[PDB]
PDB file of C-alpha atoms in Angstrom:
ATOM      1  CA  UNK A   1     -34.564  45.838  32.004  1.00  0.00           C
ATOM      2  CA  UNK A   2     -36.444  42.637  31.123  1.00  0.00           C
ATOM      3  CA  UNK A   3     -33.611  40.653  29.511  1.00  0.00           C
ATOM      4  CA  UNK A   4     -29.900  41.437  29.016  1.00  0.00           C
ATOM      5  CA  UNK A   5     -29.187  44.598  27.036  1.00  0.00           C
ATOM      6  CA  UNK A   6     -27.070  44.320  23.883  1.00  0.00           C
ATOM      7  CA  UNK A   7     -24.383  46.143  25.873  1.00  0.00           C
ATOM      8  CA  UNK A   8     -24.527  43.666  28.752  1.00  0.00           C
ATOM      9  CA  UNK A   9     -24.200  40.716  26.394  1.00  0.00           C
ATOM     10  CA  UNK A  10     -21.140  42.149  24.736  1.00  0.00           C
ATOM     11  CA  UNK A  11     -19.403  43.332  27.916  1.00  0.00           C
ATOM     12  CA  UNK A  12     -19.881  39.886  29.436  1.00  0.00           C
ATOM     13  CA  UNK A  13     -18.184  38.494  26.365  1.00  0.00           C
ATOM     14  CA  UNK A  14     -15.243  40.918  26.436  1.00  0.00           C
ATOM     15  CA  UNK A  15     -14.631  40.790  30.167  1.00  0.00           C
ATOM     16  CA  UNK A  16     -14.528  37.017  30.000  1.00  0.00           C
ATOM     17  CA  UNK A  17     -11.839  37.126  27.279  1.00  0.00           C
ATOM     18  CA  UNK A  18      -9.052  39.200  28.825  1.00  0.00           C
ATOM     19  CA  UNK A  19      -5.400  38.263  28.302  1.00  0.00           C
ATOM     20  CA  UNK A  20      -3.728  40.911  30.453  1.00  0.00           C
ATOM     21  CA  UNK A  21       0.006  41.433  31.093  1.00  0.00           C
ATOM     22  CA  UNK A  22       1.227  40.680  34.608  1.00  0.00           C
ATOM     23  CA  UNK A  23       1.395  44.449  35.186  1.00  0.00           C
ATOM     24  CA  UNK A  24      -2.378  44.838  34.909  1.00  0.00           C
ATOM     25  CA  UNK A  25      -5.093  43.821  37.291  1.00  0.00           C
ATOM     26  CA  UNK A  26      -8.821  44.269  36.894  1.00  0.00           C
ATOM     27  CA  UNK A  27     -11.328  44.381  39.772  1.00  0.00           C
ATOM     28  CA  UNK A  28     -15.087  44.585  40.233  1.00  0.00           C
ATOM     29  CA  UNK A  29     -16.645  46.008  43.384  1.00  0.00           C
ATOM     30  CA  UNK A  30     -19.819  44.162  42.468  1.00  0.00           C
ATOM     31  CA  UNK A  31     -19.612  40.807  40.622  1.00  0.00           C
ATOM     32  CA  UNK A  32     -23.088  41.523  39.255  1.00  0.00           C
ATOM     33  CA  UNK A  33     -22.110  44.860  37.748  1.00  0.00           C
ATOM     34  CA  UNK A  34     -19.821  44.300  34.771  1.00  0.00           C
ATOM     35  CA  UNK A  35     -20.310  47.869  33.595  1.00  0.00           C
ATOM     36  CA  UNK A  36     -18.137  49.412  36.327  1.00  0.00           C
ATOM     37  CA  UNK A  37     -14.649  48.289  37.244  1.00  0.00           C
ATOM     38  CA  UNK A  38     -11.117  49.326  38.038  1.00  0.00           C
ATOM     39  CA  UNK A  39      -7.886  48.563  36.266  1.00  0.00           C
ATOM     40  CA  UNK A  40      -4.566  48.788  38.124  1.00  0.00           C
ATOM     41  CA  UNK A  41      -1.343  49.169  36.185  1.00  0.00           C
ATOM     42  CA  UNK A  42       2.010  48.665  37.953  1.00  0.00           C
ATOM     43  CA  UNK A  43       4.659  49.116  35.220  1.00  0.00           C
ATOM     44  CA  UNK A  44       7.807  47.032  35.595  1.00  0.00           C
ATOM     45  CA  UNK A  45       9.809  48.907  32.987  1.00  0.00           C
ATOM     46  CA  UNK A  46       9.910  52.273  31.261  1.00  0.00           C
ATOM     47  CA  UNK A  47       9.858  55.728  32.851  1.00  0.00           C
ATOM     48  CA  UNK A  48       7.081  54.666  35.224  1.00  0.00           C
ATOM     49  CA  UNK A  49       8.567  51.468  36.617  1.00  0.00           C
ATOM     50  CA  UNK A  50       7.554  50.895  40.267  1.00  0.00           C
ATOM     51  CA  UNK A  51       4.496  53.105  39.984  1.00  0.00           C
ATOM     52  CA  UNK A  52       0.865  52.203  40.551  1.00  0.00           C
ATOM     53  CA  UNK A  53      -1.896  53.643  38.393  1.00  0.00           C
ATOM     54  CA  UNK A  54      -5.619  53.190  38.812  1.00  0.00           C
ATOM     55  CA  UNK A  55      -8.150  53.711  36.018  1.00  0.00           C
ATOM     56  CA  UNK A  56     -11.903  53.506  36.256  1.00  0.00           C
ATOM     57  CA  UNK A  57     -14.055  52.089  33.505  1.00  0.00           C
ATOM     58  CA  UNK A  58     -17.722  52.858  32.974  1.00  0.00           C
ATOM     59  CA  UNK A  59     -19.435  50.908  30.257  1.00  0.00           C
ATOM     60  CA  UNK A  60     -22.497  52.623  28.825  1.00  0.00           C
ATOM     61  CA  UNK A  61     -25.624  51.111  27.291  1.00  0.00           C
ATOM     62  CA  UNK A  62     -24.353  52.302  23.921  1.00  0.00           C
ATOM     63  CA  UNK A  63     -21.391  49.902  24.119  1.00  0.00           C
ATOM     64  CA  UNK A  64     -19.807  48.522  21.873  1.00  0.00           C
ATOM     65  CA  UNK A  65     -21.096  51.207  19.566  1.00  0.00           C
ATOM     66  CA  UNK A  66     -19.945  53.807  22.100  1.00  0.00           C
ATOM     67  CA  UNK A  67     -16.494  53.345  23.645  1.00  0.00           C
ATOM     68  CA  UNK A  68     -16.504  53.020  27.432  1.00  0.00           C
ATOM     69  CA  UNK A  69     -15.536  56.032  29.583  1.00  0.00           C
ATOM     70  CA  UNK A  70     -12.056  55.799  31.108  1.00  0.00           C
ATOM     71  CA  UNK A  71     -10.280  58.081  33.586  1.00  0.00           C
ATOM     72  CA  UNK A  72      -7.046  57.949  35.561  1.00  0.00           C
ATOM     73  CA  UNK A  73      -7.654  58.294  39.304  1.00  0.00           C
ATOM     74  CA  UNK A  74      -3.968  58.530  40.109  1.00  0.00           C
ATOM     75  CA  UNK A  75      -2.319  61.917  39.675  1.00  0.00           C
ATOM     76  CA  UNK A  76       0.624  61.392  37.334  1.00  0.00           C
ATOM     77  CA  UNK A  77       3.080  63.454  35.274  1.00  0.00           C
ATOM     78  CA  UNK A  78       2.384  62.160  31.760  1.00  0.00           C
ATOM     79  CA  UNK A  79       1.916  63.672  28.272  1.00  0.00           C
ATOM     80  CA  UNK A  80      -1.308  61.767  27.665  1.00  0.00           C
ATOM     81  CA  UNK A  81      -3.048  62.186  31.010  1.00  0.00           C
ATOM     82  CA  UNK A  82      -3.923  65.529  32.570  1.00  0.00           C
ATOM     83  CA  UNK A  83      -4.222  66.551  36.231  1.00  0.00           C
ATOM     84  CA  UNK A  84      -7.950  66.021  35.957  1.00  0.00           C
ATOM     85  CA  UNK A  85      -7.603  62.353  35.001  1.00  0.00           C
ATOM     86  CA  UNK A  86      -8.559  62.597  31.312  1.00  0.00           C
ATOM     87  CA  UNK A  87      -6.805  60.026  29.150  1.00  0.00           C
ATOM     88  CA  UNK A  88      -5.877  60.646  25.567  1.00  0.00           C
ATOM     89  CA  UNK A  89      -6.028  57.201  23.997  1.00  0.00           C
ATOM     90  CA  UNK A  90      -6.876  57.277  20.280  1.00  0.00           C
ATOM     91  CA  UNK A  91      -9.009  54.137  20.308  1.00  0.00           C
ATOM     92  CA  UNK A  92     -10.898  55.610  23.239  1.00  0.00           C
ATOM     93  CA  UNK A  93     -12.260  58.463  21.148  1.00  0.00           C
ATOM     94  CA  UNK A  94     -11.915  59.011  17.383  1.00  0.00           C
ATOM     95  CA  UNK A  95     -10.319  55.618  16.632  1.00  0.00           C
ATOM     96  CA  UNK A  96     -12.893  53.528  18.460  1.00  0.00           C
ATOM     97  CA  UNK A  97     -14.533  50.698  16.510  1.00  0.00           C
ATOM     98  CA  UNK A  98     -17.247  48.310  17.849  1.00  0.00           C
ATOM     99  CA  UNK A  99     -14.868  45.466  17.041  1.00  0.00           C
ATOM    100  CA  UNK A 100     -12.446  46.586  19.786  1.00  0.00           C
ATOM    101  CA  UNK A 101     -12.684  45.202  23.313  1.00  0.00           C
ATOM    102  CA  UNK A 102     -11.818  46.021  26.894  1.00  0.00           C
ATOM    103  CA  UNK A 103      -8.698  43.944  26.310  1.00  0.00           C
ATOM    104  CA  UNK A 104      -7.965  46.338  23.430  1.00  0.00           C
ATOM    105  CA  UNK A 105      -8.288  49.358  25.656  1.00  0.00           C
ATOM    106  CA  UNK A 106      -6.264  47.865  28.477  1.00  0.00           C
ATOM    107  CA  UNK A 107      -3.337  47.182  26.147  1.00  0.00           C
ATOM    108  CA  UNK A 108      -3.691  50.704  24.826  1.00  0.00           C
ATOM    109  CA  UNK A 109      -3.554  52.097  28.371  1.00  0.00           C
ATOM    110  CA  UNK A 110      -0.504  50.075  29.353  1.00  0.00           C
ATOM    111  CA  UNK A 111       1.315  51.141  26.221  1.00  0.00           C
ATOM    112  CA  UNK A 112       1.030  54.790  27.279  1.00  0.00           C
ATOM    113  CA  UNK A 113       3.369  53.988  30.187  1.00  0.00           C
ATOM    114  CA  UNK A 114       5.862  52.165  27.979  1.00  0.00           C
ATOM    115  CA  UNK A 115       5.904  54.775  25.223  1.00  0.00           C
ATOM    116  CA  UNK A 116       4.400  58.139  26.252  1.00  0.00           C
ATOM    117  CA  UNK A 117       3.300  60.001  23.141  1.00  0.00           C
ATOM    118  CA  UNK A 118       4.479  63.637  22.832  1.00  0.00           C
ATOM    119  CA  UNK A 119       2.199  64.033  19.832  1.00  0.00           C
ATOM    120  CA  UNK A 120      -1.264  65.339  20.798  1.00  0.00           C
ATOM    121  CA  UNK A 121      -0.636  65.229  24.565  1.00  0.00           C
ATOM    122  CA  UNK A 122      -2.932  66.590  27.276  1.00  0.00           C
ATOM    123  CA  UNK A 123       0.025  67.878  29.317  1.00  0.00           C
ATOM    124  CA  UNK A 124       2.073  69.853  26.800  1.00  0.00           C
ATOM    125  CA  UNK A 125       4.737  70.750  29.345  1.00  0.00           C
ATOM    126  CA  UNK A 126       5.266  67.046  29.991  1.00  0.00           C
ATOM    127  CA  UNK A 127       5.291  66.551  26.228  1.00  0.00           C
ATOM    128  CA  UNK A 128       7.956  69.207  25.581  1.00  0.00           C
ATOM    129  CA  UNK A 129      10.217  67.848  28.291  1.00  0.00           C
ATOM    130  CA  UNK A 130       9.798  64.425  26.699  1.00  0.00           C
ATOM    131  CA  UNK A 131      11.072  65.403  23.244  1.00  0.00           C
ATOM    132  CA  UNK A 132      13.376  68.259  24.227  1.00  0.00           C
ATOM    133  CA  UNK A 133      15.029  66.692  27.285  1.00  0.00           C
ATOM    134  CA  UNK A 134      14.560  62.919  27.428  1.00  0.00           C
ATOM    135  CA  UNK A 135      16.198  62.643  30.870  1.00  0.00           C
ATOM    136  CA  UNK A 136      14.813  65.712  32.621  1.00  0.00           C
ATOM    137  CA  UNK A 137      11.481  64.067  31.902  1.00  0.00           C
ATOM    138  CA  UNK A 138      12.838  60.915  33.523  1.00  0.00           C
ATOM    139  CA  UNK A 139      13.732  62.892  36.643  1.00  0.00           C
ATOM    140  CA  UNK A 140      10.384  64.638  36.724  1.00  0.00           C
ATOM    141  CA  UNK A 141       8.676  61.252  36.576  1.00  0.00           C
ATOM    142  CA  UNK A 142      10.753  59.926  39.500  1.00  0.00           C
ATOM    143  CA  UNK A 143      10.155  62.963  41.710  1.00  0.00           C
ATOM    144  CA  UNK A 144       6.485  63.269  40.904  1.00  0.00           C
ATOM    145  CA  UNK A 145       5.989  59.536  41.512  1.00  0.00           C
ATOM    146  CA  UNK A 146       7.602  59.826  44.939  1.00  0.00           C
ATOM    147  CA  UNK A 147       5.432  62.823  45.629  1.00  0.00           C
ATOM    148  CA  UNK A 148       6.746  66.255  44.842  1.00  0.00           C
ATOM    149  CA  UNK A 149       6.553  69.525  42.979  1.00  0.00           C
ATOM    150  CA  UNK A 150       7.344  70.204  39.339  1.00  0.00           C
ATOM    151  CA  UNK A 151       7.028  73.906  38.745  1.00  0.00           C
ATOM    152  CA  UNK A 152       4.355  75.134  41.151  1.00  0.00           C
ATOM    153  CA  UNK A 153       2.484  71.853  40.644  1.00  0.00           C
ATOM    154  CA  UNK A 154       2.403  69.163  43.317  1.00  0.00           C
ATOM    155  CA  UNK A 155       2.165  65.536  42.234  1.00  0.00           C
ATOM    156  CA  UNK A 156       0.996  63.093  44.905  1.00  0.00           C
ATOM    157  CA  UNK A 157       3.079  59.960  45.543  1.00  0.00           C
ATOM    158  CA  UNK A 158       2.026  56.909  43.528  1.00  0.00           C
ATOM    159  CA  UNK A 159       4.706  54.245  43.966  1.00  0.00           C
ATOM    160  CA  UNK A 160       3.352  50.709  44.301  1.00  0.00           C
TER     161      UNK A 160
ATOM    162  CA  UNK B   1     -33.354  31.767  19.339  1.00  0.00           C
ATOM    163  CA  UNK B   2     -31.991  30.123  22.572  1.00  0.00           C
ATOM    164  CA  UNK B   3     -31.001  26.426  22.560  1.00  0.00           C
ATOM    165  CA  UNK B   4     -33.403  24.734  24.939  1.00  0.00           C
ATOM    166  CA  UNK B   5     -31.495  23.201  27.849  1.00  0.00           C
ATOM    167  CA  UNK B   6     -33.169  20.887  30.357  1.00  0.00           C
ATOM    168  CA  UNK B   7     -32.020  20.423  33.952  1.00  0.00           C
ATOM    169  CA  UNK B   8     -33.900  19.407  37.078  1.00  0.00           C
ATOM    170  CA  UNK B   9     -34.585  22.206  39.624  1.00  0.00           C
ATOM    171  CA  UNK B  10     -32.427  20.466  42.248  1.00  0.00           C
ATOM    172  CA  UNK B  11     -29.271  20.465  40.059  1.00  0.00           C
ATOM    173  CA  UNK B  12     -26.284  22.546  41.086  1.00  0.00           C
ATOM    174  CA  UNK B  13     -24.309  25.113  39.133  1.00  0.00           C
ATOM    175  CA  UNK B  14     -21.252  22.902  38.675  1.00  0.00           C
ATOM    176  CA  UNK B  15     -23.704  20.727  36.764  1.00  0.00           C
ATOM    177  CA  UNK B  16     -24.593  23.332  34.144  1.00  0.00           C
ATOM    178  CA  UNK B  17     -20.991  24.457  33.816  1.00  0.00           C
ATOM    179  CA  UNK B  18     -20.004  20.837  33.201  1.00  0.00           C
ATOM    180  CA  UNK B  19     -22.638  20.359  30.488  1.00  0.00           C
ATOM    181  CA  UNK B  20     -21.151  23.387  28.741  1.00  0.00           C
ATOM    182  CA  UNK B  21     -17.573  22.202  29.310  1.00  0.00           C
ATOM    183  CA  UNK B  22     -18.088  18.644  28.061  1.00  0.00           C
ATOM    184  CA  UNK B  23     -20.890  18.636  25.462  1.00  0.00           C
ATOM    185  CA  UNK B  24     -19.535  17.433  22.107  1.00  0.00           C
ATOM    186  CA  UNK B  25     -22.047  19.807  20.545  1.00  0.00           C
ATOM    187  CA  UNK B  26     -20.432  22.622  22.573  1.00  0.00           C
ATOM    188  CA  UNK B  27     -17.661  22.127  25.108  1.00  0.00           C
ATOM    189  CA  UNK B  28     -16.623  25.688  25.747  1.00  0.00           C
ATOM    190  CA  UNK B  29     -13.222  26.449  27.272  1.00  0.00           C
ATOM    191  CA  UNK B  30     -14.187  28.666  30.244  1.00  0.00           C
ATOM    192  CA  UNK B  31     -17.810  29.913  29.984  1.00  0.00           C
ATOM    193  CA  UNK B  32     -19.144  32.942  31.855  1.00  0.00           C
ATOM    194  CA  UNK B  33     -22.767  32.622  32.880  1.00  0.00           C
ATOM    195  CA  UNK B  34     -25.182  35.365  33.860  1.00  0.00           C
ATOM    196  CA  UNK B  35     -28.956  35.812  34.071  1.00  0.00           C
ATOM    197  CA  UNK B  36     -31.430  38.566  34.892  1.00  0.00           C
ATOM    198  CA  UNK B  37     -32.893  38.236  38.386  1.00  0.00           C
ATOM    199  CA  UNK B  38     -35.599  40.638  39.528  1.00  0.00           C
ATOM    200  CA  UNK B  39     -34.873  43.002  36.662  1.00  0.00           C
ATOM    201  CA  UNK B  40     -31.115  43.141  37.367  1.00  0.00           C
ATOM    202  CA  UNK B  41     -28.153  41.178  36.067  1.00  0.00           C
ATOM    203  CA  UNK B  42     -26.724  38.430  38.265  1.00  0.00           C
ATOM    204  CA  UNK B  43     -23.338  36.911  37.368  1.00  0.00           C
ATOM    205  CA  UNK B  44     -23.641  33.244  38.270  1.00  0.00           C
ATOM    206  CA  UNK B  45     -20.040  32.274  37.535  1.00  0.00           C
ATOM    207  CA  UNK B  46     -16.930  33.360  35.655  1.00  0.00           C
ATOM    208  CA  UNK B  47     -13.466  31.870  36.093  1.00  0.00           C
ATOM    209  CA  UNK B  48     -11.375  34.008  33.763  1.00  0.00           C
ATOM    210  CA  UNK B  49     -11.448  36.991  36.145  1.00  0.00           C
ATOM    211  CA  UNK B  50     -10.362  36.198  39.700  1.00  0.00           C
ATOM    212  CA  UNK B  51     -11.920  39.295  41.243  1.00  0.00           C
ATOM    213  CA  UNK B  52     -15.183  37.732  40.110  1.00  0.00           C
ATOM    214  CA  UNK B  53     -14.508  33.982  40.325  1.00  0.00           C
ATOM    215  CA  UNK B  54     -13.619  34.392  43.999  1.00  0.00           C
ATOM    216  CA  UNK B  55     -17.093  35.694  44.836  1.00  0.00           C
ATOM    217  CA  UNK B  56     -19.023  33.453  42.468  1.00  0.00           C
ATOM    218  CA  UNK B  57     -17.425  30.109  43.344  1.00  0.00           C
ATOM    219  CA  UNK B  58     -19.927  29.310  46.127  1.00  0.00           C
ATOM    220  CA  UNK B  59     -22.621  29.277  43.441  1.00  0.00           C
ATOM    221  CA  UNK B  60     -21.117  26.310  41.617  1.00  0.00           C
ATOM    222  CA  UNK B  61     -21.787  24.545  44.916  1.00  0.00           C
ATOM    223  CA  UNK B  62     -25.254  26.085  45.348  1.00  0.00           C
ATOM    224  CA  UNK B  63     -28.543  24.528  44.305  1.00  0.00           C
ATOM    225  CA  UNK B  64     -30.057  25.742  41.047  1.00  0.00           C
ATOM    226  CA  UNK B  65     -33.217  27.241  42.522  1.00  0.00           C
ATOM    227  CA  UNK B  66     -31.433  28.545  45.622  1.00  0.00           C
ATOM    228  CA  UNK B  67     -30.178  30.939  42.954  1.00  0.00           C
ATOM    229  CA  UNK B  68     -33.687  32.346  42.631  1.00  0.00           C
ATOM    230  CA  UNK B  69     -33.234  30.916  39.185  1.00  0.00           C
ATOM    231  CA  UNK B  70     -36.651  30.026  37.737  1.00  0.00           C
ATOM    232  CA  UNK B  71     -37.476  28.526  34.375  1.00  0.00           C
ATOM    233  CA  UNK B  72     -37.938  29.697  30.819  1.00  0.00           C
ATOM    234  CA  UNK B  73     -35.402  32.357  31.807  1.00  0.00           C
ATOM    235  CA  UNK B  74     -32.712  32.867  29.178  1.00  0.00           C
ATOM    236  CA  UNK B  75     -29.173  32.288  30.374  1.00  0.00           C
ATOM    237  CA  UNK B  76     -26.425  34.427  28.884  1.00  0.00           C
ATOM    238  CA  UNK B  77     -23.286  32.449  28.230  1.00  0.00           C
ATOM    239  CA  UNK B  78     -20.100  33.788  26.729  1.00  0.00           C
ATOM    240  CA  UNK B  79     -16.965  31.813  25.967  1.00  0.00           C
ATOM    241  CA  UNK B  80     -13.984  31.800  23.591  1.00  0.00           C
ATOM    242  CA  UNK B  81     -16.038  29.167  21.749  1.00  0.00           C
ATOM    243  CA  UNK B  82     -18.851  31.661  21.130  1.00  0.00           C
ATOM    244  CA  UNK B  83     -18.346  34.421  18.542  1.00  0.00           C
ATOM    245  CA  UNK B  84     -21.159  36.292  20.253  1.00  0.00           C
ATOM    246  CA  UNK B  85     -22.879  35.768  23.571  1.00  0.00           C
ATOM    247  CA  UNK B  86     -25.437  32.979  23.169  1.00  0.00           C
ATOM    248  CA  UNK B  87     -28.736  32.680  25.027  1.00  0.00           C
ATOM    249  CA  UNK B  88     -29.890  29.403  26.574  1.00  0.00           C
ATOM    250  CA  UNK B  89     -33.577  28.913  27.365  1.00  0.00           C
ATOM    251  CA  UNK B  90     -33.434  27.040  30.676  1.00  0.00           C
ATOM    252  CA  UNK B  91     -35.860  24.137  31.149  1.00  0.00           C
ATOM    253  CA  UNK B  92     -37.387  23.768  34.592  1.00  0.00           C
TER     254      UNK B  92
END
């Protein structure tokens, strides 16, 4: 590139205006690359209290027109995140609007751990257990976070 | 078009950040400054994010041209004060 892309101008803007909860921490491997970074979420309440979850962000040249690409790198038992790391956050796909920011996404991500959404989940089993048996879900979360099996599926430990 | 800013080549970063922080025609809260060096983006300084501020602090203390920073080159500055990122045409 000759000058700064429209995407680079915007991302610089958004990244500089983050008002994150204490449970979230953002990091850049390269201070010069604002298009790739990690977000770490360590809930301090809700079903996932004491856990540590890492998400990767990849901002494309189509940003803010195109929403950035986000994935969970921490295996977790959750209605809205599948074993592959895909994250079902409305504003990340069909509800994205150029007016939203990284700060917008981050708050969306952290809300998933405070109020998992059984509606349109990526892990239906996890969803069912959430509506059907509130507490069994709570136990599954605990076990899976410590590292353990649920059904024939093994969830790696992810406590902070 | 970029607001023409004039500093002497010897100036330090702290200097430019201070102009932006105290100008009555500007005075931005906590500005993030970047620029394109050798076809790539170089983040000069940003305080809001510690991961970044920690590795860009030495620059405030560095000389302006020791930053490979050469003139006529548009600076990209973003701050709460700016609705959109604004470009500053540096002046030698």
